[PDB]
Structure 1
């Protein structure tokens, strides 16, 4: 599966953000769930430099369209 230059893709990244690789236990997937906005700040901070963002707003609208059209929703 690992067949790409260093650094993972964004879509997949936001995916590991939900905590797919964590203990937790009970199933946290059933109804419309939602994550926090802090995540949109962390990821956008490590990838801020990529689409000539403005400072944080433009980069904040990109990550959202990612965790908003993928599955769960994000509350900015």
Structure 2
């Protein structure tokens, strides 16, 4: 595996922790720039077809932690 979506997103987002997500979003960050990048690096471990799918998943982990 490579750094989990969580840590990748943490380091990306620029934080050391997650949240209570729906309520207190922990930070914002640029998708088409950043979420895509992570989607790229995480690809060897993603069962995704297109990068666009690879993304949907990453963005999906960002929600669970609120970003």
TM bucket normalised to smaller:
0.5 to 0.7
Moved over 6 A (4+): 21-32
Deviation string, structure 1 residues 5-62 (Cα, Å, up to 9, x no partner): x843221110111123899999998888564431111011111121221121210110
| Bigger Rg, which one | 1
If asked which structure has higher relative contact order (CA below 8 Å, sep 6+), I would say 2
TM-score (norm 1): 0.58
Give unpaired runs (5+ residues) of structure 2.
none
5+ residue gaps, structure 1, are 1-5
3-state DSSP class of the match of 1:32?
coil
Please give the root-mean-square deviation of Cα atoms over the aligned residues, in Å: 5.8
Q: TM-score, normalised by structure 2?
A: 0.64
Give the length in aligned residue pairs: 67
Instruction: From the two aligned structures, give the one with the greater strand fraction.
Output: 1
Q: Which has the higher helix share?
A: 2
